[PDB]
Structure 1
């Protein structure tokens, strides 16, 4: 555009590939940190690996005895961890597909998992209301945090692994010191907190609550900076993201089968992506390219890859 009448930055995500193969609801999609792969987890008890740029099916990883709610990559893209209804997490060698460790400790469904950036630790969240911290090398549980008084919906390490953020159906978001296991901040108001993650910087958290609201928090200050609405979220633990490769967006799934994209600053809905035929429970943003992956529930069972110019 021009200096006097500038072109507003609005994304133009368009559907590129639909990835079919899971035989039940898909729970989670994650891009490998090296940008090459997408991993998906499903109620079909399987993990599948796909080409990030071409949607090509790569491999099926099996071993869990019940449905899988989450999958996460190690920082060098060599390992995966998965969280399952069978009360365990498993660590997987990406190359061979083999189960390297089974992480035993949780007393009920495991819903969420992540490696720390150093990738010597895994954090998990469970229906059993605990957050657990595990040694990657040994598969041993190092700490059981008495984290919440209701199911844990999300767990995330910050950029240097020194903090963990957790969210729960108890209505709280908590910030934990990785080393000590101590709670350093509680955000409290509240409906169930269905999702949380740290900003790419680490200075902010983004939290979803089951009142159709996403909020951007300055956690240390305890001040809510932004609110994002216009989507439907009153039931499912829907995964949202910071999109920072091009323009600065917030991306989320929705119970009206759409992917919503907001301008992070203006809180305005800049795009709504149509195509899925059930609740979009998971979104992921590619580490380097303007690529969104989205995944949907039982009436859909597919992953979609969307590409933008900004």
Structure 2
């Protein structure tokens, strides 16, 4: 029996660092576009910045009055925006930790946020069922979209900023024209807990609270791939496209594991064990094979995992 070793690459993510410091559940982790930093947000009302490579604690950014559900980086890695239960977003100068602007308008928890590629705009989603588009320079609300009939779980700009995708507990995904705020398409029903555009421009990845992730061709309105095997019935867990090595889909799970699927085959190619509560958030480093994962109250840590491929 000669026997070789199968050819299709699989990842070998291994735990490298555990990042401790938040005093309540972590909500979101995101790598800076320049690869240097990881930002985390927490129910503890804080943002923390850490070294992306070595997990070294860098600083805490405070100012929100209640917990934070999401953070996002500007394209030039200079600014962060956070979404809080205090009904505001804040825009932060990362280097100084200064709050540059407070974005007021939502009438309930702000749950999700993102800059556009140009980083002249921010999009937000709220428990008030609306999506708002904000000018970064002035901090003023440019448009309010009557986007959904239940809390908005996610908002994301496409790669040229001309579209926004939103998801909601109402069971819908909608695509919006940025320039006009008009709805271009409705995809439709379990609650949709997460959505984002693919890096290749053509798809959206959407999570539903029936333990399912789906890759949609948004133009054609068709589901091209389904990813299962994890547990997601309760929380709005982030999912990601990993593209620095093999082409994976990465998500947290309510069984305390990080799941990694082959994007094309839909097979689970790794499960990362370590966390002691629900893995609410994962992020993939922009240039290296590094995943950051974060967990809820029983754990409160972030973990950095690295792969050869």
TM above 0.5, yes or no, is yes
Q: Determine the C-alpha separation between the residues in 2 that align with 1:294 and 1:138.
A: 33
Give CA deviations for 1:202-261 in whole Å, capped at 9, x if unaligned: 210000000000000001100000000000000000000000110000000000000000
Question: 1:6: how far off?
Answer: 4.6
1:170 and 1:5 map into 2 onto residues whose CA distance is 47
1:11 and 1:84, CA in 2 relative to 1: closer, same or farther beyond 3 A? same
Q: Residues of 2 paired with 1:142 and 1:185: CA distance?
A: 21
Partners of 1:107 and 1:70 lie apart in 2 by: 17
Q: What TM-score results when the alignment is normalised by the length of structure 1?
A: 0.98
CA drift of 1:2 comes to 12
User: In the superposition, relative to structure 1, how do residues 143 and 252 fare at CA in structure 2: closer, same or farther (>3 Å)?
Assistant: same
Distance in 1 separating the partners of 2:282 and 2:142? 30
Q: What do residues 31-59 of structure 1 show as CA deviations (whole Å, max 9, x unaligned)? A: 00000000000000000000000100000
Task: State the Cα distance separating 1:201 from its structure 2 match.
Answer: 1.5
Distance 1:209 1:2, change over 3 A: farther
Report how far residue 8 of structure 1 moved: 2.4
> Shift of residue 7 of structure 1?
2.0
Deviation at 1:4, TM superposition (A): 8.5
Give the Å deviation of 1:144: 0.2
Residue matched to 2:3: 3
When residues 257 and 4 of structure 1 are mapped into structure 2, their CA distance, relative to the original with a 3 A threshold, is closer
1:266, distance to aligned residue in structure 2 (A): 0.4
Rounded to whole Å, the distance in 2 between the matches of 1:86 and 1:26 is 17
In structure 1, C-alpha distance between the alignment counterparts of 2:157 and 2:201, rounded to whole Å: 9
Change (3 A) 1:219 1:2: farther
Give deviations 1:44-81, integer Å, cap 9, x for gaps: 00000000001000000000000000000000000000
Distance in 1, matches of 2:202 and 2:175, equals 12
Instruction: Tell me the distance in 2 between the aligned counterparts of 1:92 and 1:156.
Output: 19
Q: Judging changes above 3 Å, is the alpha-carbon distance between structure 1 residues 277 and 84 closer, same or farther for their aligned structure 2 residues?
A: same
Q: Distance in 1 between matches of 2:77 and 2:298?
A: 31
Q: Distance in 2 between matches of 1:141 and 1:109?
A: 16
Equivalent positions of 1:209-224 (< 5 A) are: 209-224=208-223
Deviation per residue, 1:176-209 (Å, 9 max, x gap): 0000100001001x00000000001221000000
